[PDB]
């Protein structure tokens, strides 16, 4: 099942921080690194035959300026630092001088501007369709980053700045009379004012429903700030609130959002893990969305205080087949063990089962990830050992079964610093480093992200055909397995071709036409991008047949919206008469329902033409062709594929795969097409940007 994909992504700088590899819902991979976040984007390239993973590389640069936490007035903080450095007591003086939280940049101290942690949002958070990146530097600067154009990541906000202002304006007291205002000349209060705003780790909720999303930021003292962001997020304007709750957990270590669904009742809470062992779920009471609701009472998952640190927590929803209901599996890496707990609401109330699956590794777990679709957990340690860890249902709760993954058989002697499954568990990405050469240390240390398969092409094909999401972008990792096979063997395997025809014959939903279009385009690449020329010309014709189909079905949707909404001159943002003539133009298209739709429209349409003009000419564009429009006197404009207006703008929204184009929405556009412009393109799901 496991073989390597041939790309290895070489990294320029040392990998840095906690759980340093993440693979987003958006199939971008981020490596937190001492001088950047390396961001690797999986493209299912349909325009080239190169069998590799086509990885586009971009990065978030480290900050240029160190993040001094605001603990007092700019003079009083300097007076306090001077006091503690001068303190004749060995304990106070060295406690101050060694804790880099108080000395984020110094004389001989090295800067800590590299990244501690990174956490992708869900998809849909950006101003585009994409997900945002939360990025935490080791000097405690917490930022939210976006890649609005493809080239340059941009900081949308700094949350460490804002929270420091919030605290300063409340004298660092969260409850208005909870204590006297402490003397900042007390090192206990000085340390406290630092501790209460030093972020440990951070995680995004799901989308909440104007959409919203929550970011919980966990501080060294066990405070959690729950930020609420308005969507689409664009900056400080989008921060809808910040509310801080007190966990009371001593030495928090890790954080995750529990989210649950049974009997059509939504519930949610935060699961928090201590550095000393225990794991507990907190009611996030302070919130203002109506759709979500909070845990009734705290529930303790592990109480033991055994001092194994909870290095990681993941949660996956599972349909339990014997209890015949929705349940939630929590797994946590604690030392060299995976704590697991299965939470299952029943008529008996919340039923809780927990255990440790044991004997996994002879060293602490360095990273963990779960296949969200099945709960298969992968765990890793500096041995270069990865272990697949399968949940098997039991009449109540689970048992875990596990087996080692023989990474040494594919990479040789290696250290593994992190792992991440792709969103569909098609690939395991893995940070690797040169290992012990028969007990010799490696003379030189270079980091690489490397990739191994976890599923065969035939399992990927089966999962793509019986797809739940029916969405090529969400499944673009499984798609890359199908791409790799077809490029390698230069034909579509018979069972897939027959099964896809059966799905098209029976269901026929535009997902299966988009899937057929993908196979044909990769096939056309595979045969060198004479009978071979006839074969190329043949399948180029077949691509056009399905590509025209996906167009005509989308044209019918556009006309559908135009018909259902108010027929008013705001229609000028759509070339309605052009589409009417085009869509009925040929008896090559059978659909009587489209022709009657055009009948109703053409009966209601005005006789006034309102033609589209080429701006450089103010001469009409006849709507001759799908891809593009041309005027007399020689100009060419790309047409949009969402609306069909021509892109005469100096800026327009090109698909991630460049298969397709769309306009930016204008304020002149009505809401019902400002909606439509946010669609994925008809030829592939992808962000059109």
């Amino acid at each position: 099942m496991v073989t390597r994909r041939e790309p290895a992504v070489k990294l320029q700088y040392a990998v840095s921080g906690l759980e340093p590899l993440a693979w987003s819902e958006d199939h971008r991979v981020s490596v937190s690194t001492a001088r950047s976040i390396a961001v690797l984007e999986l493209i299912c390239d349909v325009h080239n035959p190169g069998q590799d993973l086509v990885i586009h590389r971009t990065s978030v640069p480290a900050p240029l300026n160190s993040c001094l936490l605001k603990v007092g007035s700019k003079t009083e903080v300097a007076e306090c630092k001077e006091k503690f450095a001068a303190s004749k007591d060995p304990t106070v003086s060295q406690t101050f001088m060694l804790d880099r939280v108080f000395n984020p940049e110094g004389k001989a101290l090295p800067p800590m501007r590299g990244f501690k942690y990174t956490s992708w949002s869900p998809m849909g958070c950006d101003a585009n369709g994409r997900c945002l990146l939360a990025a935490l530097t080791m000097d405690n600067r917490l930022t939210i980053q976006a890649n609005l154009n493809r080239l340059q990541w941009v900081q949308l906000v700094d949350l460490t700045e804002i929270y420091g202002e919030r605290l300063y304006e409340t004298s660092y007291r969260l409850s208005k009379n909870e204590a006297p205002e402490g003397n900042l000349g007390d090192f206990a209060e000085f340390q406290r004012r630092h501790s209460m705003q030093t972020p440990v780790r951070m995680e995004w909720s799901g989308i909440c429903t104007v959409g919203s999303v929550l970011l919980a930021v966990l501080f060294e003292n066990g405070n959690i700030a729950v930020w609420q962001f308005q969507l689409p997020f664009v900056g400080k304007e989008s921060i809808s609130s910040c509310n801080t709750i007190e966990s009371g957990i001593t030495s928090p270590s890790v954080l995750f959002w529990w989210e649950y669904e049974h009997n059509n009742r939504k519930m949610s809470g935060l699961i928090v893990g201590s550095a000393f062992g225990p794991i507990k779920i907190l009611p996030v009471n302070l919130k203002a969305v109506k759709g979500y609701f909070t845990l009734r009472q705290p529930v303790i998952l592990w109480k033991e205080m055994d001092q194994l640190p909870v290095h990681s927590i993941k949660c996956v929803p599972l349909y339990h087949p014997y209890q015949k209901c929705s349940c939630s599996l929590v797994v946590a890496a604690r030392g060299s063990y995976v704590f697991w707990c299965l939470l299952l609401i029943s008529k008996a109330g919340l039923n809780v089962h927990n255990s440790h699956v044991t004997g996994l590794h002879s060293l602490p777990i360095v990273s963990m990830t779960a296949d969200k679709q099945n709960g298969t957990v992968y765990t890793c340690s500096s041995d270069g050992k990865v272990r697949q860890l399968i949940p098997i249902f039991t009449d109540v709760a689970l048992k875990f079964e596990h087996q080692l993954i023989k990474l040494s058989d594919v990479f040789g002697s290696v250290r593994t610093h992190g792992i991440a499954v792709s969103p569909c568990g098609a690939y395991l990405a893995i940070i690797t480093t040169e290992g012990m050469i028969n007990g010799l240390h490696p003379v030189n240390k270079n980091y690489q992200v490397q990739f191994v398969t976890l599923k065969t092409f035939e399992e990927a094909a089966a999962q793509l055909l019986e797809s739940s999401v029916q969405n090529l972008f969400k499944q673009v990792d499984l798609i890359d397995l199908v791409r790799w096979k077809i490029l390698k063997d230069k034909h579509i395997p018979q069972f897939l071709q027959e099964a896809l025809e059966k799905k098209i014959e029976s269901s026929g939903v535009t997902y299966f036409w988009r899937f057929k279009l993908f196979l044909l385009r990769i096939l056309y690449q595979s045969m060198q991008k004479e009978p071979m020329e006839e074969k190329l010309l043949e399948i180029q014709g077949k691509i056009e047949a399905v590509e025209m189909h996906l167009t005509r079905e989308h044209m019918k949707r556009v006309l559908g919206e135009v018909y259902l909404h108010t027929w008013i001159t705001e229609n000028t943002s759509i070339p309605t008469r052009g589409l009417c003539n085009f869509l009925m133009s040929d008896e090559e298209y059978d659909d009587r329902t489209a022709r009657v739709l055009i009948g109703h429209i053409s009966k209601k349409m005005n006789k006034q033409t309102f033609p589209e003009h080429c701006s450089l000419c103010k001469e009409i564009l006849p709507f001759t062709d799908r891809k593009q429009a041309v005027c007399s006197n020689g100009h060419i404009w790309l047409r949009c594929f969402l609306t069909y207006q021509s892109c005469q703008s100096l800026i327009y929204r090109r698909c991630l795969l460049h298969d397709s184009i769309a306009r930016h929405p204008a304020p002149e556009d009505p809401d019902w097409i400002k909606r439509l412009l946010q669609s994925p393109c008809p030829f592939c799901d992808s962000p059109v940007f």
Binding site: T91, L98, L109, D306, Q307, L308, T358
Partner: protein, 579 residues
């Protein structure tokens, strides 16, 4: 500032940090040591099986008599006799200078003082390991697991009335089937109790609690009985080199409760107990570059299991990959136990925040560090080095700020050879260091709150304690049959006229101009140094090396009225509390 000459002949500004360190150490121990810990782990005599003479013989180190040697003492007449002493035997203390040599049967590779609560006035002991064969040398990349012996040597109470005519006594040893021992660390405080403690016959009053780092890659924890309790419990007719086979309190090793897959970690190369009450954690540095911690009181079935013999096995609560290479030395911060420094054979010194192990507080790259010392009062660390990468003559001993104060590294002592071992006396604020050249020196640090670049000249702050010289008279036998060791000892009574006295000129001619010695064993080499951690005997120092001789010295010139008064204060308090 302060001015004039101290009564020992050093300038007052050179002595002023030394006197300051006495009070700082006493206050620290009052706050953060304790008088009792680990009450569960009292020695049980039925776990101390005495091996017979024919059972013990495989464990005994193999040299039966020392090399021939002679000791010259500055300002005394030349004795001229060659001494030689049997394995497990000692020369008598010099009647005026109280130095003692004793022979352990093999080259010494671990050594520590038994800690005693200040004011107890107890009998003082050292634990040490001397390798079986002079010619053995062990590859780091491979586990060993051979047979060896841990030795406990009693030094007496070391009071001025007791020192003339003193001798070291081999009180007992433990047969160890776990290979050679690379580090020894006693529990810093709370392990000792009075030898007269009433305990029923199975239970023996505890002398101490001791961690062994094995080349077998595991740490062994022994609670030690007072010798008188064993000898009264032992039959009187037994052979006097009492070699016991002892079940541990616990075996400490890297693993998980069902992972049989053997650890990458390899040999265990360094130890550090947590410096502060209740000392509940023990750290170890490993060949694979990990630092490992065990939570010794742990009840958890994920960390504690009881073996069929009733001893515990402990699996670690935390590990992290500190270095790209063997972690050759650890020091744990006394002033705040969240911080630890470790140095590796990738020759980086890394300072750690144990709350945040993913990134060191500071890495400073240096020469190939052999040992660290982290004295209580100073933010930085003192580094002994292997010379293989330093520029010629720029190797030596360096003090290195942890980095907030931002001072440049202070070159406290130039050395030609690699300094194998170093220790800082918290009571004195001084370091002593031992060289492949077989020279032992001490150096007094300036008050490292103040920028060392204004130190006019470091040489006035250091002096030699002894140098061993081979005199003709490569295998060990090929050396000893042809050479004897000339130990040259300084007059430590005072530092008057220091730089004009012969041993300083000999040392300064050693610095720079002298040359490395190869194509012989280096029988001259010193391998360990330890200043006394105890307030009683705080001025005493022990060292040893490839000769298998071990030498005890008293730096009379730094023992001074403030410490003598502080001893007597603590003596009176202890006698008032425990009776």
């Amino acid at each position: 500032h302060c001015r004039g000459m101290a009564p020992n002949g050093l300038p007052n500004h050179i002595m002023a940090p030394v006197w300051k360190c006495l009070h700082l150490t006493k206050d620290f121990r009052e706050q953060k040591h304790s008088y009792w810990e680990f009450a569960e782990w009292i020695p049980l005599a039925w776990k101390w099986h005495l091996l017979s003479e024919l059972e013990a013989a495989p464990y005994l180190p193999q040299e039966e008599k020392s090399p021939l040697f002679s000791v010259q003492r500055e300002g005394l007449p030349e004795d001229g006799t060659l001494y030689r002493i049997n394995r497990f035997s000692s020369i008598t203390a010099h009647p005026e200078r109280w130095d003692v040599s004793f022979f352990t049967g093999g080259p010494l590779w671990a050594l520590d003082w038994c800690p005693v609560p200040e004011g107890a006035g107890a009998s003082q002991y050292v634990a040490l390991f001397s390798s079986p064969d002079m010619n053995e040398t062990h590859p780091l990349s491979q586990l060993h697991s051979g047979p060896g012996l841990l030795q406990l040597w009693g030094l007496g109470t070391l009071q001025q009335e007791s020192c003339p005519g003193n001798r070291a006594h081999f009180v007992y040893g433990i047969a160890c089937d776990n290979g050679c021992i690379w580090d020894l660390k006693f529990c810093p405080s709370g392990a000792w109790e009075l030898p007269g403690t009433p305990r029923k016959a199975p239970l023996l009053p505890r002398l101490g609690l001791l961690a062994l780092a094995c080349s077998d890659g595991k740490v062994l924890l022994f609670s030690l009985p007072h010798p008188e309790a064993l000898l009264a419990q032992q039959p009187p007719d037994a052979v006097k080199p009492a070699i016991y086979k002892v079940q541990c309190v616990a075996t400490l090793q890297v693993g998980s409760m069902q992972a049989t897959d053997p650890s990458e970690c390899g040999q265990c190369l360094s130890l550090a107990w947590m410096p502060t009450r209740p000392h509940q954690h023990l750290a170890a540095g490993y060949y694979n570059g990990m630092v490992v911690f065990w939570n010794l009181p742990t009840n958890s079935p994920l960390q504690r299991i009881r073996l069929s013999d009733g001893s515990l096995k402990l699996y670690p609560f935390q590990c992290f990959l500190a270095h790209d290479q063997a972690v050759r030395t650890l020091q744990w911060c006394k002033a705040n136990s969240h911080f630890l420094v470790s140095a590796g054979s990738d020759r980086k010194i890394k300072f750690w925040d144990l709350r945040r192990p993913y990134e060191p507080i500071n890495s400073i790259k240096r020469f190939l560090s052999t040992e660290l010392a982290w004295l209580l009062p100073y933010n930085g660390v003192t580094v002994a080095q292997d010379n293989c990468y330093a520029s010629y003559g720029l190797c030596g001993i360096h003090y290195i700020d942890a980095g907030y104060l931002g001072f440049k590294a202070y070159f406290t002592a130039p050395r030609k050879g690699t300094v194998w071992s170093l220790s800082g006396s918290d009571w004195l604020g001084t370091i002593a260091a031992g060289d492949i050249s077989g020279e032992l020196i001490a150096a007094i640090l300036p008050d490292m709150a103040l920028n060392p670049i204004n130190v006019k000249r470091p040489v006035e702050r250091r002096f030699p304690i002894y140098k061993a010289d081979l005199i003709p008279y490569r295998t060990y036998t090929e050396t000893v049959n042809h050479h004897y060791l000339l130990f040259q000892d300084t007059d430590l009574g005072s530092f008057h006229d220091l730089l004009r006295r012969e041993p300083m000129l000999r040392m300064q001619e050693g610095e720079g101009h002298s040359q490395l010695c190869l194509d012989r064993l280096q029988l001259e080499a010193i391998h360990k140094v330890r200043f006394s951690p105890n307030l009683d005997s705080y001025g005493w120092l022990v060292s040893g090396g490839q000769s298998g001789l071990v030498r005890i010295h008293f730096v009379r010139g730094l023992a001074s009225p403030l410490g003598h008064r502080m001893q007597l204060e603590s003596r009176a308090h202890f006698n008032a509390m425990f009776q």
